[PDB]
């Protein structure tokens, strides 16, 4: 099959399907060529022996676009017997599409083009280190593509705060390796980035600058701090509305009241200044919180509000709960078959705390009022804890990028990009070759790259929406020797529960075992097929 | 001389609850009983006179009842502002007497403390002794450990704690811990740490400094 | 505006005497009843004495009858509590309270306004004024450290009463040395440091100290 | 699913008082409410069923009332035995639910602690580490400082305190404080003191020993 | 004599399974309702499941539905609580309680007898049995020091239940090391030392330790 | 005037009034001759020139009695012309009475007689010292008169407990110097002496043994312990019923119920075993507590009791309070004119606490039930504190004996024994020469024997029952220079309050002053005259 995504670290050819034999009629290809990191560019050099149908390129043609996807800038649209001129990327990706509807076709060479710009990217080990845009305090250079990465030891959170930030041009923060781990934010204004605490192990920034008129730039600072949670520890801690660890930025809403006096940022439990009220009361409004990292959610507490101007009481009487790992794919919490409606407040000042019967692993939370008295007004707390609050329960690197593409294997794909298997990060999911396969026959495998203690996994579905319902798990030190996790009741391999939804992940724990390679074998699954993203939990020996 | 006896002597409840507090005169006192509210460090304020009449400015959530020897004060929907000690008085005999008081605390959800550390300001260093203060702001409930550490060494009861009463708005507590040392002791060392433990914190938080 | 302001409180040797005063403002104390009510630290209210200035009619709680005399001077619209043969159990905050009985039977012996009180301390120890240090710093904490004083109390405001939101003034703790110490602190936004000034207002009336300290944060 | 909400959540009172505790069902539950008594470290016992009926063996001082959504449990004359956490249950829906509980402590007069000190028994000394225990027996109220002193030196938070619940007969508390040290630390020193401070004691009491 | 005795409690890894049992004595559990009720340490009662053995009719609280299965075996007059996919919030004391509903509507869902409960601990840590030292002495204090164990609980009696008056067994405290420790003590008359023997009865079921230590006080 | 008490340290003569002139008719004399300490004896030697009327000694005679007072053993009754034979004391006191109703009379010499027995008496300074009957553990010698004294520094209580005690023969304990300070107990059985805590500075034992068959004896032990009470200290501490610091011995009653199941010793607050019930319910029964030392009493707490046999509730509904400094002279607490009746209990288990409106300085307390329900049954606590719990407030030595007879002066006696001025110890009191004198003219003076800080005095009346009602106080370093304590209001010398009763003392405090000599000037007083016992309070510089 034609098409595909190619690492330009190796120079390679790309030709129309049978070249130099006449290309097939009525069939279209598309390739993405890409460099390792935004620092490098891509150059294409066409062979002079080029033959596509003439007319006015109405039918057959080659299109090259600057960057990626069909909507990027048109670098050139060609046909006839004259090959394109050398084409150089403005970023670190090109998109190529050959369209057909007779003629020898085309052939090109690709490779990385080198601008001479620096490799300013610094890694960070130090406990009390600082980071800033090179040249600080004076103006920052033009055309800069830089990655600052902080790596952390097992039980140590990275704290990252900013002293100044002024700046087309942008900074984005990643819950892992850039363009692999999830994005947490893209910043490019005068407003500074809110403090970040992270228990992933990795946190990275990506600074991008343009040719035109530099601003004051940015300076920031980081600490690594030890965290020993107890044995006697319950996952019911407040997540940061009242304390402010959830910063203003992280709180947002479907809309807000016109006078500007009932903003999202006022929805903090026990706040002294009104609360959040939307532009118009209906049951399709929401207040949203972006926790930034995958967090366990175990309880929601809510309040009404008393107007500071008029002393009138307003409160939500009931709500629903939507969660999401990416802010795009949402799930409404359920109580058996139908949506769960929570009973909320009965006056403007009492706090009413709803414990989820089913703890939820999520990143974004939405409260959606259903009924109310006199109007919608919320103040809110969320309770929970982080995955890494349990002993030996670190995320081993599918989500972040710490387990490279070349360490993820699959029994059989229907395509391949191993990055598509990653918990949350991935934009698709792993599908097998035959979507509707036989149980206990298809599998997905991680190479941890070292003997580890493995205490669980986190399974997710895939977006074509489908998900595993049940699975088995096997492990190995070697690669050819395999034990399945046994149920001491049946004495057959233990059947784990999968998901009830394509996005909202689920965490399964098991007794500690040694393994460098782990495998997951789907047993039952959803109609559409076997969709799966995955992460593994454990620690070092 | 008429003795007044209140019950319970302290109670805690959640904002929204209907609270009831009781008063027993040691002899028939008709309906001549008054109730006062005392907030921390303030003078008491009259709520109710003649057993059931509200005094001006007192919100309608308060009410009282009784005659003879049994009197009750009810709050129908406790607010954070209502944290206070409540007293009955008899206004029947020639000599007034007050009940022993009933302290009303407030129950609320766990809230995590904000910690801050304070080094001794030069001004003090001149006087010889040196005071390092640790601040735990706006937490709940009141239980909380604050261990000091000089060069990674656990310290004694040469520290002192003070706690505030519940805040009248958010019902939280705040706490200060002060460690005092001499010229010779503070000057000679560098690593000074305050490690706070509290229910609302998933793990112990540490705030520290050097000279 | 009815106001009652007590004064006279302070340190006094056991056996000694002390004289408290309750300046009435806003109303004419004759034609009211004026009561003294005291509260030992951490304990409850105890009624002490009263006087109806018009008639001169006075009475006393058994625990003080003999030792205390109540009086009024209507020209100065003030009332007094001469205390004698004092002992440790007389240590307490003393409050004056107004009763308004004329034509209202229901309000008889009901105390409708109270002053803020004055602390009387029956001790052999000596007066000692405090020493007031700063506690230098999207949220910042700053405060004052009021160290080594006797007797209680000390009062602390910020920006002369203007700054109140976020303020936490602690109860004093008795030190091993025999003196008191408290701290006051307030949490503000950390954006406005270097622009906004923050002075705390310490005041220890027993030793005539009235300090104002200015709290502020290699080349 | 029906939620039960009790108030107050804790209270303290004097033997002899008439206590009343409250329960609010989140929807009409008729008179199907029961009350249970849980004493410390024991299983709960049924007191009242169908809102107002006494269960066998339960003394007549207990009683209950209410219907619909408001229910009350009264003790007419609290006894020391009645220290306990009290729970309401609704017995109306398909799924039972309990209220969050109300803790009833007892108020009484100040009582002074008896102090005892315990040296580590040879048997332990063999294992390496060494545990000196300080016992404060039968005091009230619960507030009490227990500072350890090794060679007249105030010690850290390498001591640990444990307290008992109120005794069901005299309503008092007891407290243990244990200090653990190594072979090398205990062997090397001689003066070990426990100094207790408590309201009921006119002056600090010290109990100490030598090896 | 109605009796309900729970068993099966202990340490269990997160994700693991455990099976509790409630032996009925004195009555035939069929024709009653048997409920499980749990209590997380220091928190309140939460109803979990029930079963009416005659009919087989069972139901579950939402927080456990899915994970727990209740069952009864009337021949053995016992009831069971199979627990699966356990997590930290399942840590708690579990109680079985009898309901007696037949012909008494008023008593429906009312739980008239309870067992003493069994402690389930959801932890990754390891079992460790205690070490039991004496605390050697007109009033004397003597006790036992039960040091370094996991998980809870340990039980302590004196003279095999005969000595109860004056006994104070403390709540265990979690040590820095990760283990538990408590002390038991009893105060007796100091006249009867040297005559009366005093042995304390320690018992830690999770690690099959059943110790009895004899407490006893230059030529 | 004839008669008197004579220290035998100096040998002296005693004769009939005019000897050798004929003695007066119709008039009787009596002398007590005494040695410093029970160790020594007294010998009398009559002059041979002796003339008393004959007949059969029906009218005129000399009587000598063994010991003291008229009821002691008759050593001899003589008259006619033959002088008595040498007479030697069996103790350390003789009593002589000459009776008359013509003749030259008699003359005798007295002096101390010496037996040769030891001076075993030991003083004690040591912090951890012990004391025992000499020869211990073997049997104790015959005829032993020994004094063991413990002296203590300013703020240190003496603790004294006993390991064994078996023994005509006796041990008595003194709150000060023997036969000067008050007695606290005479012990001579198998029951050991209960623990003693004392803040006096002195505590002394007196061991006395006979000729006949020694028992096992006694061994005991003592500690001195530092006591720093605070500034913030309130005199409301429990005195020892519940804790047992008040030992069983100290509790006694008018009577107790016949079955022996409701004893005094069961009247402890919160006791689990019945309570105290008297032999017959009436309002003239009492329970008594001997605190042993002068103690401030500020509150009484009381309870009823539930029978362990029958579960029936009994309780006192009201009581009265009698106090006494010696167990012989009693005062019923008053509320103005009449007796104060306290309201007590209304069920068998509640505690009802009555604060005295007027704190009381006392040693013995009696509760006297007035009304009750079903029967009298009490359990009891007493609250208070010791005089020495206030800063610089030590008893300077009138009560104990630490201020010797030769340091107490008086303006004018009507007799003299200076020991009669002592607070509590004394069995009489100081009376002036003219009982009904002029105010500000009569005075009583202590020589502290060193410059001290003086913070108050404790005034008592006298037994002829009379007492000072008001007084002034003056002080001096020298002896001739005198300042009066000034009222800063009048600017005249301050008028202190005296007593309202002849036994129940009252404590007056004043601002600290320097003085070695202190004086008290009665201003008003009781009908019968100026009666006074006294003690001074302060410390060293
Ligand atoms: C950080 O170190 C280097 C240089 O910064 C870079 O190759 C890479 O981004 C990081 N290290 C690796 C290879 O993981
Ligand atoms: C971190 O900063 C510098 C080294 O970069 C050093 O001087 C300072 O002491 C360090 N801070 C600490 C000790 O955490
Ligand atoms: C104690 O010392 C001696 C000998 O024991 C004795 O004279 C007297 O009783 C005491 N000391 C004095 C003189 O006070
Ligand atoms: C007291 O007893 C002896 C000396 O008589 C001595 O050996 C012992 O150490 C002393 N006890 C202490 C140190 O208090």
Coordinates of C-alpha atoms in Angstrom, one line a residue, chain B residues 6-211:
Chain B
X6 CA -27.1 25.2 80.1
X7 CA -26.8 22.1 77.9
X8 CA -25.0 21.0 76.0
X9 CA -21.9 23.0 77.1
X10 CA -20.5 22.6 73.6
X11 CA -21.6 21.3 70.3
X12 CA -20.5 21.3 66.6
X13 CA -22.7 21.3 63.6
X14 CA -22.8 22.0 59.9
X15 CA -23.8 25.2 58.2
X16 CA -27.5 24.6 57.4
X17 CA -28.4 22.6 60.5
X18 CA -31.1 23.4 63.1
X19 CA -29.5 23.8 66.4
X20 CA -31.2 23.8 69.8
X21 CA -29.6 24.7 73.1
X22 CA -31.1 24.3 76.5
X23 CA -31.3 26.2 79.8
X24 CA -32.7 25.2 83.2
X25 CA -33.4 27.7 86.0
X26 CA -33.1 26.2 89.5
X27 CA -36.5 27.8 90.4
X28 CA -39.6 29.1 88.7
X29 CA -38.4 32.2 86.8
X30 CA -41.6 32.7 84.6
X31 CA -40.6 33.9 81.1
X32 CA -37.8 36.3 82.3
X33 CA -34.9 34.8 80.5
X34 CA -32.6 36.5 78.1
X35 CA -30.0 35.0 75.6
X36 CA -26.7 36.7 74.6
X37 CA -24.2 35.9 71.9
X38 CA -20.5 36.3 72.5
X39 CA -18.1 36.1 69.5
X40 CA -14.4 35.6 70.2
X41 CA -12.7 38.6 71.8
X42 CA -15.8 40.7 71.6
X43 CA -18.4 41.8 74.0
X44 CA -21.7 39.8 74.2
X45 CA -24.8 41.0 72.3
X46 CA -28.4 40.5 73.3
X47 CA -30.4 38.2 71.1
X48 CA -33.6 37.3 73.0
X49 CA -35.4 38.8 76.0
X50 CA -38.4 37.6 77.9
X51 CA -37.8 34.0 76.7
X52 CA -39.1 34.5 73.1
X53 CA -38.7 38.1 71.9
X54 CA -36.2 38.9 69.3
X55 CA -34.1 42.1 69.9
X56 CA -33.6 44.6 67.1
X57 CA -31.3 43.6 64.3
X58 CA -31.2 40.0 65.2
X59 CA -31.9 37.7 62.2
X60 CA -35.1 35.7 62.2
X61 CA -33.2 32.4 62.3
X62 CA -33.0 32.9 66.1
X63 CA -35.8 32.0 68.4
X64 CA -36.5 31.1 71.9
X65 CA -39.1 29.4 74.0
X66 CA -40.1 28.2 77.4
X67 CA -41.4 29.2 80.8
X68 CA -41.1 28.3 84.4
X69 CA -37.8 26.5 84.5
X70 CA -37.0 25.1 81.0
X71 CA -35.9 27.5 78.2
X72 CA -34.6 26.7 74.7
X73 CA -32.8 28.8 72.1
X74 CA -33.0 27.6 68.5
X75 CA -31.0 28.5 65.4
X76 CA -33.1 27.2 62.4
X77 CA -30.2 27.3 59.9
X78 CA -26.7 27.8 61.4
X79 CA -24.4 30.2 59.5
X80 CA -20.6 30.5 59.8
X81 CA -21.2 33.9 61.4
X82 CA -23.0 32.1 64.3
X83 CA -19.8 30.6 65.7
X84 CA -19.9 32.0 69.3
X85 CA -20.5 31.2 72.9
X86 CA -24.2 31.5 73.9
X87 CA -25.4 32.5 77.4
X88 CA -28.8 32.4 79.1
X89 CA -29.5 34.9 81.9
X90 CA -32.3 34.9 84.4
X91 CA -33.8 38.4 84.8
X92 CA -36.2 37.5 87.6
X93 CA -34.4 37.7 90.9
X94 CA -32.9 40.9 92.5
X95 CA -29.4 39.6 91.4
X96 CA -28.9 38.5 87.8
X97 CA -27.1 35.3 87.1
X98 CA -25.9 33.9 83.8
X99 CA -25.7 30.3 82.6
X100 CA -22.2 28.7 82.2
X101 CA -22.3 29.2 78.4
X102 CA -22.6 26.9 75.3
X103 CA -19.8 26.9 72.7
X104 CA -21.1 26.4 69.1
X105 CA -18.3 25.2 66.7
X106 CA -18.9 24.6 63.0
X107 CA -18.3 21.4 61.0
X108 CA -17.1 21.6 57.4
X109 CA -15.1 19.8 54.7
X110 CA -11.4 19.1 55.0
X111 CA -9.4 22.2 53.8
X112 CA -5.6 22.1 53.3
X113 CA -3.3 24.6 55.0
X114 CA -1.1 27.1 53.2
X115 CA 2.3 27.1 54.8
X116 CA 4.8 30.1 55.1
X117 CA 8.1 30.3 56.9
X118 CA 9.6 33.5 58.4
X119 CA 13.2 34.3 59.2
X120 CA 14.2 36.6 62.1
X121 CA 14.5 40.2 61.0
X122 CA 18.0 41.8 61.6
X123 CA 16.3 44.2 64.1
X124 CA 15.8 41.3 66.5
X125 CA 19.1 39.6 65.8
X126 CA 20.6 42.7 67.5
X127 CA 18.8 42.0 70.8
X128 CA 20.6 38.6 71.2
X129 CA 17.8 36.0 70.8
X130 CA 16.3 34.8 67.5
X131 CA 12.7 33.9 66.5
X132 CA 11.7 31.7 63.5
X133 CA 8.0 31.6 62.9
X134 CA 6.0 29.0 60.9
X135 CA 2.5 29.9 59.5
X136 CA -0.2 27.4 58.6
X137 CA -3.1 29.4 57.0
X138 CA -6.7 28.6 56.7
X139 CA -7.1 24.8 57.3
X140 CA -9.5 22.4 58.8
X141 CA -9.9 20.4 61.0
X142 CA -7.7 21.8 63.8
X143 CA -5.5 18.7 64.2
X144 CA -2.1 19.4 62.7
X145 CA 1.5 18.5 63.5
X146 CA 4.3 21.1 63.1
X147 CA 7.8 19.6 63.6
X148 CA 10.8 21.9 63.5
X149 CA 14.1 20.6 62.1
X150 CA 17.5 22.2 62.8
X151 CA 20.2 20.7 60.4
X152 CA 17.8 17.8 59.8
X153 CA 17.4 17.2 63.5
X154 CA 13.9 16.9 65.2
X155 CA 13.5 19.6 67.8
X156 CA 12.1 19.8 71.3
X157 CA 9.3 21.8 73.1
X158 CA 11.4 24.9 72.8
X159 CA 8.8 25.8 70.1
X160 CA 5.4 27.3 70.9
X161 CA 2.0 27.0 69.0
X162 CA -0.9 29.4 68.9
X163 CA -4.2 28.7 67.1
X164 CA -7.0 31.1 66.1
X165 CA -10.7 30.5 66.7
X166 CA -12.8 29.4 63.7
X167 CA -13.0 32.2 61.0
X168 CA -16.5 33.6 60.9
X169 CA -16.6 33.4 57.1
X170 CA -15.0 30.1 56.0
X171 CA -14.9 28.3 59.4
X172 CA -11.3 27.5 59.1
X173 CA -8.4 27.7 61.6
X174 CA -5.0 29.2 61.4
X175 CA -1.9 28.3 63.5
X176 CA 1.5 29.8 64.2
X177 CA 4.5 28.0 65.6
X178 CA 7.5 29.9 66.9
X179 CA 10.9 28.5 67.8
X180 CA 13.2 30.8 69.8
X181 CA 17.0 30.3 70.0
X182 CA 20.0 32.3 71.2
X183 CA 22.6 34.3 69.3
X184 CA 25.1 31.5 69.6
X185 CA 22.6 28.8 68.5
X186 CA 21.0 30.5 65.4
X187 CA 24.3 32.0 64.2
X188 CA 26.1 28.6 64.4
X189 CA 23.6 26.7 62.1
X190 CA 22.2 27.0 58.6
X191 CA 19.4 24.5 57.8
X192 CA 16.0 25.5 59.4
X193 CA 12.9 23.5 58.3
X194 CA 9.3 23.5 59.2
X195 CA 7.5 20.3 58.3
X196 CA 3.6 20.4 58.4
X197 CA 1.3 17.3 58.5
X198 CA -2.4 17.6 58.1
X199 CA -5.3 15.5 56.9
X200 CA -6.0 17.6 53.9
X201 CA -2.4 17.2 52.7
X202 CA -1.7 14.0 50.7
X203 CA 2.0 14.2 51.9
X204 CA 3.9 16.2 54.4
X205 CA 4.7 19.7 53.1
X206 CA 8.1 21.3 54.2
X207 CA 9.0 25.0 54.2
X208 CA 12.6 25.9 55.0
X209 CA 15.4 28.5 54.5
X210 CA 19.1 29.3 55.0
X211 CA 21.0 32.5 56.3

